[PDB]
């Protein structure tokens, strides 16, 4: 488990690429450690800054009939794509949003 991944420098996860796609990691002594039988979880709070909001800034007519879950989904997706490089998000199997 990697807890609060957004709190770290956006380069540590560069070391997870070989973990996610190849399932291995080599330490500084040259030994290859096998990651093929583990479960990787990464927790984050990205894209959850507008939950305590009722409207946007400008003029509006109807009021965004979509529920909070869909807005959270879209914001999370956008923030994840903005914060992580595409090759890293291409290796993550599942992205789950918590309502």
């Amino acid at each position: 488990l990697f807890d609060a991944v957004e709190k770290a420098h956006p380069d540590i996860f560069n070391s997870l690429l070989q973990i996610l796609e190849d399932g291995r990691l080599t330490d500084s002594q040259g030994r290859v450690v096998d990651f093929k039988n583990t479960v990787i979880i990464m927790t984050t709070n990205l894209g959850t800054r507008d939950i305590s909001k009722g409207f946007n800034l400008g003029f509006a007519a109807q009021g965004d009939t979509k529920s909070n879950y869909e807005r959270m989904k879209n914001k999370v997706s956008d923030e994840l794509k903005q914060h992580f490089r595409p090759e890293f998000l291409n290796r993550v199997d599942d992205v789950v949003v918590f309502p």
């Binding site: 909001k53 009722g54 409207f55 946007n56 800034l57 400008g58 003029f59 509006a60 007519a61 109807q62 009021g63 965004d64 009939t65 979509k66 529920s67 909070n68 879950y69 807005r71 309502p99």
Partner: protein
């Protein structure tokens, strides 16, 4: 600076008459906003008493060209060329305040002294410009072109609901409404 914050919330605010400088600023802002995020909408607020035709054409083409949808809001008035810009927004996303008025009329022009050939060329140009204005108003509305022909002969003033019935706008703002709020 409130205008800055309006800009980070993807609002381009048009509060002055339509000339070359205003057209350049609005078009540059549109290009920047499209480059930042080619999927989120861009809001244009109109409070201008018309302006020149070439700047109107440039702004109209830039609005039609950019990938994101454009939401036009009429605040105050849209007198001569601003009516076309208000009607040039994304269909279903053009709206006006309750106590707002939209004006339409044929273009007014004047030329300096010259020989008859120059005046004839200028008159042909002005006729072409008026025909292009008629086509722009006919495409982005509901009424047929002949009704536009007869309407824009003199000044035509429309209220918010009158403009909505005319087809230039789609909705009339009433008051602030909150979001769905359902978890």
């Amino acid at each position: 600076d409130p205008y800055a914050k309006l800009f980070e919330e993807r609002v381009i605010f048009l509060g002055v008459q339509i000339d070359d400088a205003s057209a350049n600023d609005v078009m540059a802002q549109l290009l920047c906003l499209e480059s930042m995020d080619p999927d989120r909408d861009i809001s244009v607020y109109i409070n201008s008493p018309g302006g020149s035709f070439t700047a109107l054409t440039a702004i109209y083409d830039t609005m039609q060209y950019v990938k994101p949808d454009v939401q036009t809001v009429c605040m105050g008035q849209a007198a001569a060329a601003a009516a076309v810009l208000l009607a040039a927004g994304t269909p279903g996303k053009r709206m006006a305040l309750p106590n707002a008025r939209v004006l339409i009329h044929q273009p007014y022009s004047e030329t300096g002294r010259g020989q008859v050939s120059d005046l004839e060329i200028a008159a042909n140009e002005i006729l072409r410009m008026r025909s292009q204005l008629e086509d722009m108003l006919a495409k982005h509305s509901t009424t047929p072109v002949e009704k536009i022909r007869e309407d824009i002969e003199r000044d035509k003033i429309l209220t918010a609901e009158d403009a909505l019935s005319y087809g230039l706008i789609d909705q009339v703002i009433s008051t602030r409404k909150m979001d769905n709020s359902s978890l």
